[PDB]
Amino acid sequence: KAPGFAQMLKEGAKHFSGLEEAVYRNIQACKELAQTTRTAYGPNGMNKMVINHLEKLFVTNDAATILRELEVQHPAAKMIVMASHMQEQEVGDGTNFVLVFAGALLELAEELLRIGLSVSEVIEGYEIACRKAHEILPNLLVPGGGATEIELAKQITSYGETCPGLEQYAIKKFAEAFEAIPRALAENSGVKANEVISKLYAVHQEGNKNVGLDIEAEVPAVKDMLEAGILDTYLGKYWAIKLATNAAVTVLRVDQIIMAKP
Amino acid sequence: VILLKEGTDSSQGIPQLVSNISACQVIAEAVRTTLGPRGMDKLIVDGRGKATISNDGATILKLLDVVHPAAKTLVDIAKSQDAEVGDGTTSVTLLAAEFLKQVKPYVEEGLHPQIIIRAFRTATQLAVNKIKEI
Amino acid sequence: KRESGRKVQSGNINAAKTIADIIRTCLGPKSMMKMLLDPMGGIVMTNDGNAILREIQVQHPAAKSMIEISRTQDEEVGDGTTSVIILAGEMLSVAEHFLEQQMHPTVVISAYRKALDDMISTL
Amino acid sequence: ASEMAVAHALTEKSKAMTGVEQWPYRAVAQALEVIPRTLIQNCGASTIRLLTSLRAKHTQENCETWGVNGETGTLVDMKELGIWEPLAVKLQTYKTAVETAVLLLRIDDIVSGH
Amino acid sequence: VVAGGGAIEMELSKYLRDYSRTIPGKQQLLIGAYAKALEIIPRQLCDNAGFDATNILNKLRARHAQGGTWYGVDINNEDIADNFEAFVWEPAMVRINALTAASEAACLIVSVDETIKNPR
Amino acid sequence: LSVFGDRSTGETIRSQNVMAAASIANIVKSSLGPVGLDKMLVDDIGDVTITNDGATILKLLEVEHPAAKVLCELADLQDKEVGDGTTSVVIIAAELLKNADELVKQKIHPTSVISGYRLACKEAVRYINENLIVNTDELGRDCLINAAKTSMSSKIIGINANSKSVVPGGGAVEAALSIYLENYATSMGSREQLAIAEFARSLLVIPNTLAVNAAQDSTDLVAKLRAFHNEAQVNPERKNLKWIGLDLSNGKPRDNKQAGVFEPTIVKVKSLKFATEAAITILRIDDLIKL
Numbered sequence A: 001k002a003p004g005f006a007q008m009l010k011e012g013a014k015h016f017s018g019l020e021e022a023v024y025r026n027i028q029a030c031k032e033l034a035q036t037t038r039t040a041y042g043p044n045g046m047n048k049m050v051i052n053h054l055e056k057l058f059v060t061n062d063a064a065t066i067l068r069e070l071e072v073q074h075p076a077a078k079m080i081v082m083a084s085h086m087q088e089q090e091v092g093d094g095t096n097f098v099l100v101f102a103g104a105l106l107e108l109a110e111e112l113l114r115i116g117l118s119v120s121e122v123i124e125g126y127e128i129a130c131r132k133a134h135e136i137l138p139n140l141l142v143p144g145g146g147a148t149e150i151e152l153a154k155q156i157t158s159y160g161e162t163c164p165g166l167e168q169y170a171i172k173k174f175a176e177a178f179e180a181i182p183r184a185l186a187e188n189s190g191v192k193a194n195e196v197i198s199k200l201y202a203v204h205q206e207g208n209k210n211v212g213l214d215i216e217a218e219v220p221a222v223k224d225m226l227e228a229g230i231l232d233t234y235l236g237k238y239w240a241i242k243l244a245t246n247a248a249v250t251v252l253r254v255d256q257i258i259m260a261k262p
Numbered sequence B: 001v002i003l004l005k006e007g008t009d010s011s012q013g014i015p016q017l018v019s020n021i022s023a024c025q026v027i028a029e030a031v032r033t034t035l036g037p038r039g040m041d042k043l044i045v046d047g048r049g050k051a052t053i054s055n056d057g058a059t060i061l062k063l064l065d066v067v068h069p070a071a072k073t074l075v076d077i078a079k080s081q082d083a084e085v086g087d088g089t090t091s092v093t094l095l096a097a098e099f100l101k102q103v104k105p106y107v108e109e110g111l112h113p114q115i116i117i118r119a120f121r122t123a124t125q126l127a128v129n130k131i132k133e134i
Numbered sequence C: 001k002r003e004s005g006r007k008v009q010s011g012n013i014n015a016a017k018t019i020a021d022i023i024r025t026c027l028g029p030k031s032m033m034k035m036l037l038d039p040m041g042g043i044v045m046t047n048d049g050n051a052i053l054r055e056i057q058v059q060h061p062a063a064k065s066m067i068e069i070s071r072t073q074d075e076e077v078g079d080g081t082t083s084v085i086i087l088a089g090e091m092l093s094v095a096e097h098f099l100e101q102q103m104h105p106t107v108v109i110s111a112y113r114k115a116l117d118d119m120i121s122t123l
Numbered sequence D: 001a002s003e004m005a006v007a008h009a010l011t012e013k014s015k016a017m018t019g020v021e022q023w024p025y026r027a028v029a030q031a032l033e034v035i036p037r038t039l040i041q042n043c044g045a046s047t048i049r050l051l052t053s054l055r056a057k058h059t060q061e062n063c064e065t066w067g068v069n070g071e072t073g074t075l076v077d078m079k080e081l082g083i084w085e086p087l088a089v090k091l092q093t094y095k096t097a098v099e100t101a102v103l104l105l106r107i108d109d110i111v112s113g114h
Numbered sequence E: 001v002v003a004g005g006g007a008i009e010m011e012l013s014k015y016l017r018d019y020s021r022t023i024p025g026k027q028q029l030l031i032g033a034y035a036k037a038l039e040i041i042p043r044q045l046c047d048n049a050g051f052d053a054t055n056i057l058n059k060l061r062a063r064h065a066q067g068g069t070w071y072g073v074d075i076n077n078e079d080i081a082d083n084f085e086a087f088v089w090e091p092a093m094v095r096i097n098a099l100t101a102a103s104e105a106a107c108l109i110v111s112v113d114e115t116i117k118n119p120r
Numbered sequence F: 001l002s003v004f005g006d007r008s009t010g011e012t013i014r015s016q017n018v019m020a021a022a023s024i025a026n027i028v029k030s031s032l033g034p035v036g037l038d039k040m041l042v043d044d045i046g047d048v049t050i051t052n053d054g055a056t057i058l059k060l061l062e063v064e065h066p067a068a069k070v071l072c073e074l075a076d077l078q079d080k081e082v083g084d085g086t087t088s089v090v091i092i093a094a095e096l097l098k099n100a101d102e103l104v105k106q107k108i109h110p111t112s113v114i115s116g117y118r119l120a121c122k123e124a125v126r127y128i129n130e131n132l133i134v135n136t137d138e139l140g141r142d143c144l145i146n147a148a149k150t151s152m153s154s155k156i157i158g159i160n161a162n163s164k165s166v167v168p169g170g171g172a173v174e175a176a177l178s179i180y181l182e183n184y185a186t187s188m189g190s191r192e193q194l195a196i197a198e199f200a201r202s203l204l205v206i207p208n209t210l211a212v213n214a215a216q217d218s219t220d221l222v223a224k225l226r227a228f229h230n231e232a233q234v235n236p237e238r239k240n241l242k243w244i245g246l247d248l249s250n251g252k253p254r255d256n257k258q259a260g261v262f263e264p265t266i267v268k269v270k271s272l273k274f275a276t277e278a279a280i281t282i283l284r285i286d287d288l289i290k291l
């Protein structure tokens, strides 16, 4: 009986209407991929009781082993997983950087699309911010513990505030995507994440770079990553920010999943 | 049509930990009455109908082979204690489920699991130091 | 019967936000009209924010507070009443920091009261 | 104009607001933008395009002007268009919105009894 | 060696509980929760032996406060007894490995937050 | 049995009265302290009386339940006798019942629980009386200025045109008694060690509730209070802080003797006595007969 399903003419696939926000659904598949690995991020990462295909029990916190055992069937999630596989090429770390960062770019993109900003304009902002991040990263081995993620966010947020036009909305959200990584370290350590971001921005406002999250259960304060000896690799952050943005942009460019047959 | 799980059953957060805490208490109840020399016996029947009566905690866990994921952790830990020592599997099994029971209401109140681990790692070393001193 | 917990604040937000979404388009000289189905099948095509909410039935007490505060505005000032409900609904519509971030209302209220002293000075 | 003019003051003043209160403090500023958001929606002009340029004018040019024309939809200075409203109406409109939002936020249990 | 019958478990419950008070923070309730968990060893020995765990544990925990260090549960007589003088001993290193394996086993369960299952 | 009414017995009757008193407490739990949140009161007509005062809520709170009405009759006893502390009474009595109900599940008879709570209130009043400060520090000392200063700081005046005896408040009494009564429980025994211990743990709800209302981590602040108070018990050395209270604004413990956060002695004494008598009155109820 009419009116049936709207915009459904290709093999009866689940085509979300204009009200159902087909783009919003492919993003939700990627956000769920981050929550499966957002908790395993950092030294206090939570282990996963993985059950192998041979009915074998393994308790681990490695991202590559989680995804290799988790049969990811959604194609929108496979793209981010393919970036993790491409992350393994040219570097052997930063896998969860691709999952956590890309999940924040897509999660924050929904706040822009909901306002009414076009998906093609959101992509131009992330591509501009990725190019801007590669110029700021040499100025920052780089500090870890979420230190670069706040400074790189602070430097990119200022570029978006002075840049007029519509690209500033996606450029600012590109900076807030970096904040998800300190928020992951704080949540996995049992600390109010908003208090970590508030302190990390204050010390960076005073110019105290190289300051990261002090990993401690009973101390939500911060410390210098240089004095403690915590350091990350430059190419690990370079190729992670690059592949994560391409995976997020590649998902945003897609608006409809369609079946086929040879 | 297009879903992420497609048979992949998964749950996360506080409900998963609370589910494992309750599953660990089941292994405790199976060896709770056998603690001590005068502990109650346990009757176990294999597939062939052959009976097995024994009040040893280690022998009981070998015959159960519980399929729950969290329960296998205690069984493999208790089995290792039997191979290395041959005694104390019931004390290890009961204390583990009891550490989990006491922190159960705090986990429900929003206390992070990692803060609980720092307490066990801290309280354990203080206890081991008190044993050698006394 | 009664409401308790986080369901109350998120519920009061949806009630106040819903009352503001009615009269979002009733602002300005190019205001849009509204169709009020009377119980006898009649229609009133008014575009006055005070008249619309006066005739609408509300079940949530939060909506009654929003409407009753608007009536107090009309007695003092016969203009800008529609701006009160829209701003009050938009200030409450930001439920990210309210519940999803698990901030206490006293933290939010202290910020809203700090901004109000700054909004007054800037005007 | 008064909404966007006030919102720029809070956003610039929130930069020196160390703490977690900066986030809701800035959210109030973005809430004032809804007033021109509705004036632009009614005229039919693009909301994001004009509201974006509208905020840029308050940054560079003086904040006392460069509002929105509800009839035409384009931007216009209030010195050129007599849309000047009183102060007592806006102050009481701003207090009643915050005082009302503070009220409903202070409610945590809808209880029955007499 | 140390006194068996749960005597050492009650002494640690006194030390950790009195130590938790001097530890400000979230570790206070947890180290105290760790202490009460040690009560199960002398408790089930009373419950399995048909004794009243309340009257023994209260009489046992009171003795450790006054200066007791080896008093514990007597499965034969329904009363407390100095398990060291009664030659009810156990190896200290075997008891040390029990607490370590217990906490290490509980930590593995507490550190877990999600279970993953390949569909097969 | 055939009757002209209905009857219901068992342990579930205790639980039903426990969950009822616990419900009435949650209606006035978040509104505890000066930073308490307001609450609506939808009358039968439709009026909405909005207020945060716990006494004003209980006068207008109408819950048709016997156990709840016992706490309403209890409120009048505290209001007339003193005129304050009614909110802490209903909250303290609710936690004693929720904790006692757990003991009853451990085969602890209510008579043994009623005996423990009576002895705990007696010793608590003794420890309170031994740790008072008489009405003094009027002139030449500063047992006032800091009291009035902290009270007026809420308004714009805070910058600097158009009772015979008192006790440190802010959970200092409830935190100090948490350590003393827990140690006193180890001395008595005889099926009362657990009840006096649960009486000790129940008092921590007051600093735990005041911390939640102040937008702070209650688990940490409650632990910090008990640590400074426990160190006072270990030795009387001056390095160990004493009589440390709870500051709601700064979210940190503070010595109330300097801050001037004082309360009458009869409040903490009567509130513990009336709350204990209320939980005793409900714990003795093991059956219900309707007609």
Ligand SMILES: Nc1ncnc2c1ncn2[C@@H]1O[C@H](COP(=O)(O)OP(=O)(O)O)[C@@H](O)[C@H]1O
Pocket (backbone or CB within 6 Å): A040, A041, A042, A043, A063, A093, A094, A095, A096, A097, A143, A144, A145, A146, A185, A212, A213, A215, A230, A232
């Ligand atoms: N000891 C530490 N203190 C603070 N931060 C750390 C520490 N160890 C690792 N990190 C942070 O955790 C992040 C992930 O590290 P790693 O586990 O090596 O990569 P992946 O999570 O991709 O496997 C890094 O960006 C680093 O900043």
Ligand SMILES: Nc1ncnc2c1ncn2[C@@H]1O[C@H](COP(=O)(O)OP(=O)(O)O)[C@@H](O)[C@H]1O
Pocket (backbone or CB within 6 Å): C026, C027, C028, C029, C049, C078, C079, C080, C081, C082, C083, D039, D068, D069, D070, D071, D083, D085
């Ligand atoms: N000609 C106009 N151009 C732009 N904005 C206008 C114009 N007339 C009114 N407004 C805006 O509409 C809002 C509501 O005005 P008014 O209708 O007088 O009050 P109310 O809506 O409360 O009755 C005012 O805040 C004002 O800024």
